[PDB]
Design an enzyme around this catalytic site. Sequence first.
Site, PDB file in Angstrom:
ATOM      1  N   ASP A  57      -6.891   7.847  -0.797  1.00 31.83           N
ATOM      2  CA  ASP A  57      -6.382   6.855   0.139  1.00 31.83           C
ATOM      3  C   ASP A  57      -5.260   7.487   0.899  1.00 31.83           C
ATOM      4  O   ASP A  57      -4.416   8.104   0.257  1.00 31.83           O
ATOM      5  CB  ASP A  57      -5.841   5.664  -0.605  1.00 31.83           C
ATOM      6  CG  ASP A  57      -6.939   5.024  -1.432  1.00 31.83           C
ATOM      7  OD1 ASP A  57      -8.058   4.893  -0.955  1.00 31.83           O
ATOM      8  OD2 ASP A  57      -6.666   4.691  -2.565  1.00 31.83           O
ATOM      9  N   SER A  92     -12.225   9.817  -4.469  1.00 31.11           N
ATOM     10  CA  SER A  92     -11.873   9.592  -3.085  1.00 31.11           C
ATOM     11  C   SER A  92     -10.358   9.496  -3.021  1.00 31.11           C
ATOM     12  O   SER A  92      -9.701   9.301  -4.064  1.00 31.11           O
ATOM     13  CB  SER A  92     -12.515   8.329  -2.602  1.00 31.11           C
ATOM     14  OG  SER A  92     -11.987   7.198  -3.272  1.00 31.11           O
ATOM     15  N   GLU A 110       0.787  -1.206   0.000  1.00 34.89           N
ATOM     16  CA  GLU A 110       0.000   0.000   0.000  1.00 34.89           C
ATOM     17  C   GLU A 110       0.830   1.271   0.000  1.00 34.89           C
ATOM     18  O   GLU A 110       0.568   2.197  -0.765  1.00 34.89           O
ATOM     19  CB  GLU A 110      -0.905   0.053   1.221  1.00 34.89           C
ATOM     20  CG  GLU A 110      -2.041  -0.940   1.229  1.00 34.89           C
ATOM     21  CD  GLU A 110      -3.063  -0.881   0.098  1.00 34.89           C
ATOM     22  OE1 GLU A 110      -2.966  -0.066  -0.816  1.00 34.89           O
ATOM     23  OE2 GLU A 110      -4.003  -1.660   0.119  1.00 34.89           O
TER      24      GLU A 110
END
Length: 130
Positions: free
Chosen positions: A53, A51, A35
Site C-alpha cells: 500500500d 502487495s 491510512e
Amino acid sequence: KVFERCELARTLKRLGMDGYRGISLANWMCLAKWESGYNTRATNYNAGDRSTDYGIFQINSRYWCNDGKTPGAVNACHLSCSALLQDNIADAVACAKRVVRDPQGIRAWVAWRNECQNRDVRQYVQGCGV
C-alpha cells in the site's frame, strides 16, 4: 512529506475531492489520517498476498497502481506505484477518484469502514476554512 491537516484539506478541495460522488471532504481527510497520518511516503507491505500500500491514501499494488513485483496486478489507475510516493499528490487524488468510481466506492478501503464510517469526521476539517 507529511501534510499539515488544513494544508491537506485545502489541497484536496482545490483538486476537486469535496463532494466527489457525494463524498464529503471530511471523509477523505479521515481516510488519509488513519491510512498514513497525512504522509505521502507511507508504505505498508502485506505478507498474505504480497502487495504493498502506497502513499497518503495507501492505495494497493494489486488492483490500482503497478510496482512490478505484485502477483495478479491489475493496475486500474494506469499508474506506477512510485507516483503515489511523491510530495505532489495530484496523481494520488486522480487514482483515489478512479477507486470510488467502481461499485464499492469509498468502502474499498477497510480503514474507512472500521475507522471513519459512523465516526464524526467534521473534526478533521474544523478551522481550515474549507
